[PDB]
Ligand binder design. Structure first.
Ligand SMILES: CC(C)C[C@H](N)C(=O)OP(=O)(O)OC[C@H]1O[C@@H](n2cnc3c(N)ncnc32)[C@H](O)[C@@H]1O
Ligand SMILES: [Mg+2]
Ligand SMILES: [Zn+2]
Length: 776
């Protein structure tokens, strides 16, 4: 054993030892329990930096821990290669997106290999390769013929800087997710996934996820935004039906989220384009001028119609008003009004002298009918509501439902803030949409045998429009239904399509007959442990659950949920500079910020490895903070981690130098001195603590600190006697195994100096319970 700790000697040798043994190349082996640990794969939008390294080191620690515990561990890595991240970085450097992506991938592979992650590289995927994206094209066509994917014109989010439409989940505070530019509204046909068909299942199945952070589930619940409401039909008065036809001559229908206030409705509003408004305006120029002023176009305005509808629950004849705040096409185009319990209706009734019937009371408060007081749903009881008096909200809801159901005048209706997922992008670098437009047959999907629709890679966009719409050699084709002249779709799929199913592709990444093979899907099931940032809560983490249910319903998988456990690691943060983002190693001082290529404050892992070794980089990331807490970059933290590794190396070197290796102490410890019994007590207490920290608490910094304390007590114990050396051997053999998930290169090397067996076959250290009993 050499005296000096030299990471450049031992880390390549350890990595070759692990690669040769193929311990990370796993098959569907039915003898060991499976463990699927996955970190969110990166965009090839530049060099990885230490923030990514923290993400992936956390995954490796958990993978290596489960490996030593006898699991068949799949930890796969790959490249989220399509979409704006890679393309925007390529265009900034005048490089074609394809060439830029593949070169970035190869540098990112060398970075990760230098860090010694226990990755099954034989499962590597690159999402921009046709062997990958053909299968999402296949799924697209299958869902298109079912109507789960559809094309429709509509109002969309337009990003004027990235020059593409964006999904709702990609609009962050009204700004594009990559550009930061203020979003605009346009009318543009897009392709949609009917994710609202799965809104209820997406919402309810969150309750299954006992091992997700509550915050992620809460954000998804609010994004889905379910509201249980009530459809209510008001019978049109017999004297108020002139000019109307069909249902509009019979009833006026509205949707409301407060049917407990239905007994308090004092008037009703309709949109200017509602058939009741147009029928009432036919005989009166009073309303036509208001409908014209409304159809032209915020402050609330309204006019009475003289038409009346009948409240189904008490028979009150409410007057119909035309109001500029009632949007047509939004629902029924009509609403009821409860001013005493809705602030908007209170203002409308105050501005136009409309009654205010109180129907809810909160505790012991009075009702001043001319001053709005702060609409409580949770704390409230009904008054002036017939047999509804005394009922709280949820009981009044179901009671009103039963009442309306008995007369055919209404029924419960659930709505969601979630809208359908718009996936069309006016971008070159993305999965081609497998549609051909035929003048005779319409928008037709490409046959399965003709898939993939191959994206040409010989393209350098100029930044002025969709490049594919500019290439007749791409879009001119034949219709697959009739053989006439036709045009391929030239929009591509948003990059989140690829990340919504890549975790299944890892299970069988060379499978040529489908997205994922039935045998491998049945073996691996779902991801046991997922690690990635909280920024994915409303988009990827929601999209992925949706795709999983889609693929399940197509018969491709048999799980309901893609990810069992989710760890959202904290951000690595670092100082930033701008002028034009500079890097600290090389103006303005924009202050401490998340490490990101977008701010050019990333620390390259390869440079730290070249100066200090991969084990140092890994150790600092796991020791500096609990994994969910943000971690501030620090040179002294790097140096402190390196000194500990020198201490570990020096500790074993000095032990071996004074006698060499002996057999570790084991068995009954009666006869050991008290100092050595205390050391064994600390040793096995530390094994229990580390085991619990890796497994149950997932707190790796305190695991490292526990091992440091064991070494502290070791240093203060005289271990030079024969029994001392056996206990020293035991301490050091446990210590390097406990730390191997964190710093495997130095622990593998030290293990081989201590013991001739293979570390991963000696397994995880066991707790000797007899060592934990205190002496009398
Ligand atoms: C599943 C896909 C939609 C993922 C997508 N391709 C993506 O986000 O790719 P990206 O390459 O941006 O990030 C890859 C992973 O690294 C984490 N990460 C990045 N910066 C930092 C940081 N400063 N501190 C800690 N962690 C960080 C980030 O949260 C993510 O889990
Ligand atoms: Mg369960
Ligand atoms: Zn045709």
């Amino acid at each position: 054993m050499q005296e000096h700790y030299q990471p450049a000697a031992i880390e390549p040798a350890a990595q070759k030892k692990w690669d040769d043994a193929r311990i990370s190349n796993v098959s569907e082996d039915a003898s060991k329990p499976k463990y699927y640990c996955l970190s969110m794969f990166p965009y090839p939008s530049g060099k990885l930096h230490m923030g990514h390294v923290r993400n992936y080191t956390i995954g490796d620690v958990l993978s290596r821990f489960k490996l030593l515990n006898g699991f068949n561990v799949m930890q796969p890595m790959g490249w989220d290669a399509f979409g704006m991240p890679a393309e925007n970085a390529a265009m900034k450097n005048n490089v074609a997106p394809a060439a830029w992506t593949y070169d970035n991938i190869e540098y990112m592979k060398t970075q990760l290999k230098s860090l010694g992650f226990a990755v099954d590289w034989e499962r590597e995927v690159a999402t921009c390769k046709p062997e990958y994206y053909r299968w999402e094209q296949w799924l697209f066509t299958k869902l298109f013929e079912k109507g789960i994917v559809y094309r429709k014109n509509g109002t969309v989010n337009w990003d004027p800087v990235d020059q593409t439409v964006l999904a709702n989940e990609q609009v962050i505070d009204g700004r594009g997710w990559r550009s930061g530019a203020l979003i605009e509204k346009r009318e543009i046909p897009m392709y949609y996934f009917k994710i609202t068909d799965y809104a209820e299942e997406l919402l309810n199945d969150l309750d299954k996820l006992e091992h997700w952070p509550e915050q992620v589930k809460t954000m998804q619940r609010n994004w889905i935004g379910k509201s249980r409401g009530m459809t209510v039909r008001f019978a049109v008065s017999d004297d108020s039906k002139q000019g109307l036809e069909g249902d509009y001559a019979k009833f006026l229908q509205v949707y409301t989220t407060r049917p407990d206030t239905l007994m308090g409705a004092t008037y009703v509003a309709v949109a200017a384009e509602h058939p009741l408004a147009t029928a009432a305006a036919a005989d009166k120029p009073e309303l036509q001028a208001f409908i014209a002023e409304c159809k032209a176009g915020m402050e609330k305005k309204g006019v009475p119609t003289g038409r009346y509808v009948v409240n189904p629950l008490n028979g009150d004849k409410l007057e119909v008003w035309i109001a500029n705040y009632v949007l047509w096409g939004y629902g029924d185009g009509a609403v009821m009004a409860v001013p005493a319990h809705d602030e908007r209706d209170f203002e409308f009734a105050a501005k136009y002298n409309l009654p205010k019937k109180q129907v809810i009371a909160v505790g012991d408060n009075a009702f001043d009918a001319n001053r709005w007081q702060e609409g409580d749903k949770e704390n409230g009881v009904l008054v002036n509501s017939g047999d509804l008096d005394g009922l709280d909200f949820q009981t009044a809801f179901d009671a009103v439902a039963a009442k309306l159901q008995s007369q055919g005048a209404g029924e419960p209706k659930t709505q969601y803030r979630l809208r359908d997922w718009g996936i069309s992008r006016q971008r070159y670098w993305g999965c081609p949409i497998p549609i051909v437009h035929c003048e005779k047959c319409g928008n037709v999907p490409v046959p399965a045998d003709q898939l993939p629709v191959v994206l040409p890679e010989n393209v350098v966009p100029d930044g002025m429009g969709s490049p594919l719409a500019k290439m007749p050699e791409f879009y001119e084709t034949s219709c697959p239904c009739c053989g006439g002249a036709a045009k391929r779709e030239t929009d591509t799929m948003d990059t989140f399509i690829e990340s919504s199913w890549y975790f299944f592709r890892y299970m069988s990444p060379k499978f040529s007959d489908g997205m994922v093979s039935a045998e491998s899907a049945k073996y691996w099931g779902a991801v046991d442990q997922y690690i990635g940032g909280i920024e994915h809560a409303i988009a990827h983490l929601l999209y992925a659950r949706f795709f999983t249910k889609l693929m399940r319903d197509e018969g491709l998988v048999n799980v309901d949920e893609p990810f069992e456990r989710l760890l959202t690691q904290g951000m690595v943060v670092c100082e930033t500079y701008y002028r034009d983002w500079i890097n600290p190693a090389d103006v303005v001082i924009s202050g401490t910020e998340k490490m990101s290529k977008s701010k050019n404050n990333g620390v390259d892992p390869q440079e730290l490895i070249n100066a200090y070794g991969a084990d140092t980089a890994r150790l600092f990331m796991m020791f500096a903070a609990p994994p969910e807490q943000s971690l501030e970059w620090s040179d002294s933290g790097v140096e402190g981690a390196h000194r500990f590794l020198r201490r570990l190396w020096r500790t074993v070197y000095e032990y071996l130098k004074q006698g060499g290796a002996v057999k570790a102490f084991a068995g009954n410890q009666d006869g050991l001195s008290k100092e050595l019994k205390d050391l064994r007590h600390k040793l096995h207490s530390t094994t229990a603590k580390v085991s619990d920290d890796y497994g149950r608490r997932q707190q790796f910094n305190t695991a490292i600190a526990a091992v440091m304390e064991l070494l502290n007590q070791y240093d203060k114990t005289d271990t030079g006697s024969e029994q001392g050396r056996a206990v020293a051997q035991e301490v050091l053999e446990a210590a390097v195994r406990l730390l191997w998930p964190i710093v495997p290169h130095i622990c593998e090397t030290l293990w081989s100096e201590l013991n001739g067996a293979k570390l991963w076959e000696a397994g995880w250290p066991t707790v000797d319970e007899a060592a934990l009993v205190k002496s009398e």
